[PDB]
Amino acid sequence: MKLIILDRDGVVNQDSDAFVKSPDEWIALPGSLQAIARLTQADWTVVLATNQSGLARGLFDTATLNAIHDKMHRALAQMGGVVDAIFMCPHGPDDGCACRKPLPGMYRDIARRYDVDLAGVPAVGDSLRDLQAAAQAGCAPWLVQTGNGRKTLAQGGLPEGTRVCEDLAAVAEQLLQEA
């Protein structure tokens, strides 16, 4: 198999200062859905690992979150792309869970789901906590410049060997060039 793990806000869809709280607030970033479609057609398994503290904060309920992902799924499907699974942390910053990035919980759950070693698995994020979670779990971190990515890059302290791309479309192009 060829696994790739993606953060959601700031990588697939536009981040929001106010949280993404409804389907209308979920807006794909240019090229991101097409990027997923390319990887899908090249036989990659694409999985999300996303912090969704909006649930713990009571900003929206699981029905609404499922509707957001339904919107994503439909948009991707028409392009021939598929997200195989969504791993998500519903907790807030001080809720003491195992799954909130930068903890590696979700990445560990993904490894268990597919029964794989995460060595060399690309994990794409826009925030330092994405890179740290992925690196701790054994992945190869990739940082995009959408979302929080420019700030993350500027602040440094990235895991050694983190690769930097302008957006998810550029990441997919690089993976497929180097295939």
Ligand SMILES: [Mg+2]
């Ligand atoms: Mg993000």
Ligand SMILES: [Mg+2]
């Ligand atoms: Mg672009």
Ligand SMILES: [Zn+2]
């Ligand atoms: Zn959690």
